[PDB]
Write a protein that holds these residues in place. Structure first.
Motif, PDB file in Angstrom:
ATOM      1  N   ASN A   1      15.770  20.164  88.582  1.00 46.09           N
ATOM      2  CA  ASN A   1      17.191  20.240  88.902  1.00 46.09           C
ATOM      3  C   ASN A   1      17.450  19.886  90.363  1.00 46.09           C
ATOM      4  OD1 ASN A   1      18.534  21.767  86.339  1.00 46.09           O
ATOM      5  ND2 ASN A   1      16.474  22.559  86.747  1.00 46.09           N
ATOM      6  N   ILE A  42      17.924  33.011  98.034  1.00 45.49           N
ATOM      7  CA  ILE A  42      17.943  33.555  96.685  1.00 45.49           C
ATOM      8  C   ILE A  42      16.922  34.675  96.541  1.00 45.49           C
ATOM      9  CG2 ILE A  42      17.399  32.998  94.286  1.00 45.49           C
ATOM     10  CD1 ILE A  42      18.743  30.293  94.732  1.00 45.49           C
ATOM     11  N   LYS A  55      21.659  43.522  87.171  1.00 47.76           N
ATOM     12  CA  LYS A  55      21.118  42.303  86.582  1.00 47.76           C
ATOM     13  C   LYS A  55      21.983  41.082  86.861  1.00 47.76           C
ATOM     14  CE  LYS A  55      18.620  44.645  82.878  1.00 47.76           C
ATOM     15  NZ  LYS A  55      18.280  44.612  81.428  1.00 47.76           N
ATOM     16  N   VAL A  57      23.595  38.819  90.049  1.00 47.06           N
ATOM     17  CA  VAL A  57      23.610  38.573  91.487  1.00 47.06           C
ATOM     18  C   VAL A  57      25.055  38.395  91.936  1.00 47.06           C
ATOM     19  CG1 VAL A  57      22.663  37.197  93.360  1.00 47.06           C
ATOM     20  CG2 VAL A  57      21.379  37.453  91.226  1.00 47.06           C
ATOM     21  N   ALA A  59      28.307  38.216  94.894  1.00 39.65           N
ATOM     22  CA  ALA A  59      28.593  37.520  96.143  1.00 39.65           C
ATOM     23  C   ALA A  59      28.184  38.358  97.346  1.00 39.65           C
ATOM     24  CB  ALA A  59      30.077  37.161  96.217  1.00 39.65           C
ATOM     25  N   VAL A  62      24.530  37.807  98.162  1.00 35.74           N
ATOM     26  CA  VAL A  62      24.306  36.555  98.879  1.00 35.74           C
ATOM     27  C   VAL A  62      24.760  36.680 100.327  1.00 35.74           C
ATOM     28  CG1 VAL A  62      24.970  34.128  98.997  1.00 35.74           C
ATOM     29  CG2 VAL A  62      24.386  35.159  96.792  1.00 35.74           C
TER      30      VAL A  62
ATOM     31  N   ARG B  31      22.735  24.796  88.560  1.00 37.80           N
ATOM     32  CA  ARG B  31      21.484  24.672  87.821  1.00 37.80           C
ATOM     33  C   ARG B  31      20.282  24.821  88.744  1.00 37.80           C
ATOM     34  NH1 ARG B  31      24.208  20.364  84.988  1.00 37.80           N
ATOM     35  NH2 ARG B  31      23.061  18.885  86.306  1.00 37.80           N
ATOM     36  N   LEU B  32      20.351  24.236  89.944  1.00 39.57           N
ATOM     37  CA  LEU B  32      19.259  24.393  90.900  1.00 39.57           C
ATOM     38  C   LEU B  32      19.100  25.849  91.320  1.00 39.57           C
ATOM     39  CD1 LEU B  32      17.103  23.324  92.878  1.00 39.57           C
ATOM     40  CD2 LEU B  32      18.953  23.013  94.532  1.00 39.57           C
ATOM     41  N   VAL B  33      20.217  26.544  91.546  1.00 45.08           N
ATOM     42  CA  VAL B  33      20.156  27.954  91.922  1.00 45.08           C
ATOM     43  C   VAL B  33      19.501  28.771  90.815  1.00 45.08           C
ATOM     44  CG1 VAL B  33      21.536  29.994  92.424  1.00 45.08           C
ATOM     45  CG2 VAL B  33      22.071  27.834  93.536  1.00 45.08           C
ATOM     46  N   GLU B  35      17.438  27.679  88.486  1.00 48.69           N
ATOM     47  CA  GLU B  35      16.029  27.315  88.398  1.00 48.69           C
ATOM     48  C   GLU B  35      15.217  27.998  89.489  1.00 48.69           C
ATOM     49  OE1 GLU B  35      14.729  22.956  88.296  1.00 48.69           O
ATOM     50  OE2 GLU B  35      13.722  23.725  90.089  1.00 48.69           O
ATOM     51  N   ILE B  36      15.752  28.037  90.710  1.00 48.20           N
ATOM     52  CA  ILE B  36      15.055  28.691  91.813  1.00 48.20           C
ATOM     53  C   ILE B  36      14.946  30.191  91.568  1.00 48.20           C
ATOM     54  CG2 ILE B  36      15.240  29.268  94.255  1.00 48.20           C
ATOM     55  CD1 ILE B  36      16.256  26.490  94.785  1.00 48.20           C
ATOM     56  N   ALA B  37      16.019  30.811  91.073  1.00 45.58           N
ATOM     57  CA  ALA B  37      15.999  32.249  90.833  1.00 45.58           C
ATOM     58  C   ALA B  37      15.106  32.632  89.661  1.00 45.58           C
ATOM     59  CB  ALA B  37      17.418  32.761  90.592  1.00 45.58           C
ATOM     60  N   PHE B  40      11.877  34.188  90.636  1.00 41.37           N
ATOM     61  CA  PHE B  40      11.928  35.521  91.222  1.00 41.37           C
ATOM     62  C   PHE B  40      12.188  36.609  90.190  1.00 41.37           C
ATOM     63  CE2 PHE B  40      13.740  32.908  94.884  1.00 41.37           C
ATOM     64  CZ  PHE B  40      12.487  32.686  95.421  1.00 41.37           C
ATOM     65  N   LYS B  41      13.113  36.378  89.261  1.00 37.29           N
ATOM     66  CA  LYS B  41      13.402  37.350  88.217  1.00 37.29           C
ATOM     67  C   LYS B  41      13.995  36.620  87.022  1.00 37.29           C
ATOM     68  CE  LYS B  41      15.644  41.818  87.359  1.00 37.29           C
ATOM     69  NZ  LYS B  41      16.112  41.383  86.014  1.00 37.29           N
ATOM     70  N   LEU B  44      18.302  36.482  84.807  1.00 37.40           N
ATOM     71  CA  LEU B  44      19.254  36.797  85.859  1.00 37.40           C
ATOM     72  C   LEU B  44      20.618  36.189  85.555  1.00 37.40           C
ATOM     73  CD1 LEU B  44      17.683  36.732  89.427  1.00 37.40           C
ATOM     74  CD2 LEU B  44      18.690  38.622  88.138  1.00 37.40           C
ATOM     75  N   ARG B  45      21.666  36.907  85.948  1.00 41.56           N
ATOM     76  CA  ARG B  45      23.033  36.421  85.853  1.00 41.56           C
ATOM     77  C   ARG B  45      23.622  36.253  87.247  1.00 41.56           C
ATOM     78  NH1 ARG B  45      26.652  38.105  81.195  1.00 41.56           N
ATOM     79  NH2 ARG B  45      25.344  37.876  79.330  1.00 41.56           N
ATOM     80  N   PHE B  46      24.567  35.325  87.368  1.00 40.64           N
ATOM     81  CA  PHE B  46      25.186  35.006  88.646  1.00 40.64           C
ATOM     82  C   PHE B  46      26.699  35.069  88.518  1.00 40.64           C
ATOM     83  CE2 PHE B  46      21.924  33.597  91.629  1.00 40.64           C
ATOM     84  CZ  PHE B  46      20.828  33.480  90.801  1.00 40.64           C
ATOM     85  N   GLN B  47      27.342  35.708  89.490  1.00 37.00           N
ATOM     86  CA  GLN B  47      28.786  35.609  89.621  1.00 37.00           C
ATOM     87  C   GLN B  47      29.166  34.230  90.146  1.00 37.00           C
ATOM     88  OE1 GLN B  47      30.346  38.816  91.991  1.00 37.00           O
ATOM     89  NE2 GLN B  47      30.229  40.257  90.274  1.00 37.00           N
ATOM     90  N   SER B  49      31.486  33.597  92.349  1.00 37.40           N
ATOM     91  CA  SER B  49      31.639  33.694  93.797  1.00 37.40           C
ATOM     92  C   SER B  49      30.298  33.642  94.515  1.00 37.40           C
ATOM     93  CB  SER B  49      32.385  34.979  94.159  1.00 37.40           C
ATOM     94  OG  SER B  49      31.812  36.102  93.512  1.00 37.40           O
ATOM     95  N   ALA B  50      29.246  34.200  93.913  1.00 38.70           N
ATOM     96  CA  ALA B  50      27.922  34.133  94.524  1.00 38.70           C
ATOM     97  C   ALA B  50      27.449  32.690  94.641  1.00 38.70           C
ATOM     98  CB  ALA B  50      26.928  34.966  93.715  1.00 38.70           C
TER      99      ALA B  50
END
Lengths: 77, 96, 98, 107, 98, 103, 78, 98
Positions: A1, A42, A55, A57, A59, A62, B31-33, B35-37, B40-41, B44-47, B49-50
């Protein structure tokens, strides 16, 4: 990616930085640097989230990760 | 009609220094974020805004790095940025 | 019908200051959030500097002079002196009132 | 009977909340005790900094023919002021963009 | 006449650790001061990170988990994991004894 | 019986606990937190002291001097990253000469 | 006029420790100016710390705190 | 014909000698005088502890050595072996001090 950061995107980022002429080898180096930076931020954010027993992440995670690395970011809480 | 090699570069510099919107596409960066995360875990879910904050920080960091790289390239009597310029900028900053 | 929790912010005070300095001028939500984050960051910086100033001198109370020294340490020059002037004027007025 | 309630910000002549600053200082794990004048002084300093940044941002917005401050105006105000730029040197403003600066050698 | 006021330092503990790792190697006064300052700096870093972690999570107590997260955030790579293992071993033994 | 002896540590658990309580870090301090922090501090001290002793033995010295500590810190990658913005008095610098400057 | 006390051989020695093989003649004035600016910043912070303590003697601890505030932590002086 | 080393052997010898050594490279009395002269502008009749001046000299020498390493890297980047003020300016600009 990492290939999703296309050559025109890196060119635009350089133009915002005032770069007029870009070598062809800039793109791989920029992708690697961006990957390292994102990996660090990250990792810190995921550490913060795991400490919170969350579970998702957020804002704030970050923002705290960036502030820890001396990169305080406004506009997200 | 053809502009000379550098007129469009200056035009783009002016346009993107006037503008403030993000320069990286949202979906590839997300998608890169993810893949990188993943390393680590898992699960994982991302907001939203994050991810937006991550994109803003990454773009600001890359713009500052490119400014320093342009300064390094000018220091070497050049107008073209090269990977050695980026490496020198990061070494002087204290990152490598 | 679950009311959202109370989230405190400096939005109203920043708006009042903006109306003082620019009556016919507004502020967007993102700019207001940025100003709130700036206020929070400066508050944290000054409070931490005052806390370590008190700890260094083996004092348990953060007073006006600790905050003044923190402002002098953290602000760049003319900003520092004008902030000190404003703070001393406010403290003098508050003491004079009650 | 009890006297009419007067806010400490009103006594100090400040717009920022002295009481909220005092409560944050008490509950911020900064020191065992917080003086009466510390929240007043800190509120005054915060108000002065906010006034400076907001005035410069309003000037920038008026220059851009806008009647509403956006993050771009805040970024322009901060980076065009030497002392504000030094204070927020390690701070990134979201949606703030960059200042127009093209090196002379590239012209 | 009067003994100087006692100033607490980590000299004896650093000396014990040095004797554990190098039975025959000594240490100079300047090196001991540097080690003491290093210990103080690391303690301040970890404690500040743990305090910020507790504040971010609206907690009033600093526990082993908060310090452990501070260690993971502050120490790089193998240092962080080895410190985590050593600390968990120490805490497990301490809770196992009394 | 000292709390350091219970955890099998050489660093003072009680002193660390008192500093945490009197350091204005949180309203309360847990029981295992000073143990964990003392263990981490002891481990870091042991690592730096081992590397400094190796440097001292390589320099034919039996006493660790600031030069040995500086060499130990800057030769270890992770220790160098941890103390990147730290200056050690009388530590000097590493013998680094750029290849372009050699004859 | 004590900035001239930082003599050319001193700047040359500092450059040699930094790995510099050849030094231009205009380097010395720039180095003196940079050193003056750095010392001005650190001494200003140290004097602020001393004045807050109501002391008239600048102590080593004040210098250490000033360096730490500027992200230049110093080990070996307390 | 008297013996003469070529222009660059002695420079490398000096580099090696001053990288092997750890003693301060600036004279103590001129540096103390410079510190006192600078401090005169901030507060009159200031006294200085010896350890304070020693710490200031240590920090200044470390900062100057790091700046000179960055300057050497910048000069090598420009395909030069001579450091120039423009190299120092570039290093300080990239570091973020200008």
């Amino acid at each position: 990616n990492i290939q999703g950061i296309t050559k025109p995107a890196i060119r635009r980022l350089a133009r915002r930085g005032g770069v007029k002429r870009i070598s062809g080898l800039i793109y791989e180096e920029t992708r690697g640097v961006l990957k390292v930076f994102l990996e660090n931020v990250i990792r810190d954010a995921v550490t913060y989230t795991e400490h919170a027993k969350r579970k998702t992440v957020t804002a704030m995670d970050v923002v705290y990760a960036l502030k820890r690395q001396g990169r305080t970011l406004y506009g997200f809480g | 009609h053809r502009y000379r090699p550098g007129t469009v570069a200056l035009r783009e510099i002016r346009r993107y220094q006037k503008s403030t919107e993000l320069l990286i596409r949202k979906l590839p960066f997300q998608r890169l974020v993810r893949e990188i995360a993943q390393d680590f875990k898992t699960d994982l879910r991302f907001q939203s805004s994050a991810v937006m904050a991550l994109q803003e920080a990454s773009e600001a960091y890359l713009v500052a790095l490119f400014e320093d790289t342009n300064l390094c390239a000018i220091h070497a009597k050049r107008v073209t940025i090269m990977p050695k310029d980026i490496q020198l900028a990061r070494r002087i900053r204290g990152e490598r | 019908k679950r009311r959202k929790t109370r989230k405190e912010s400096y939005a109203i005070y920043v708006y009042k200051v903006l109306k003082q300095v620019h009556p016919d001028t507004g502020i967007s939500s993102k700019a207001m959030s940025i100003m709130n984050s700036f206020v929070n960051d400066v508050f944290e910086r000054i409070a931490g500097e005052a806390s370590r100033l008190a700890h260094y001198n083996k004092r348990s109370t953060i007073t006006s002079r600790e905050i003044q020294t923190a402002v002098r340490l953290l602000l760049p020059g003319e900003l520092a002196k004008h902030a000190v002037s404003e703070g001393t004027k406010a403290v003098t007025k508050y003491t004079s009132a009650k | 009977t009890r006297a009419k309630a007067k806010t400490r910000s009103s006594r100090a002549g400040l717009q920022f909340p002295v009481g909220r600053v005092h409560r944050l200082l008490r509950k911020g794990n900064y020191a065992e005790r917080v003086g009466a004048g510390a929240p007043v002084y800190l509120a005054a300093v915060l108000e002065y900094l906010t006034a400076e940044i907001l005035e410069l941002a309003g000037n920038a917005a008026r220059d851009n023919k806008k009647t509403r401050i956006i993050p771009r105006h805040l970024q322009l105000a901060v980076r065009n002021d030497e002392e504000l730029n030094k204070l927020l040197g390690r701070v990134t403003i979201a949606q703030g963009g960059v200042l127009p600066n093209i090196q002379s050698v590239l012209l």
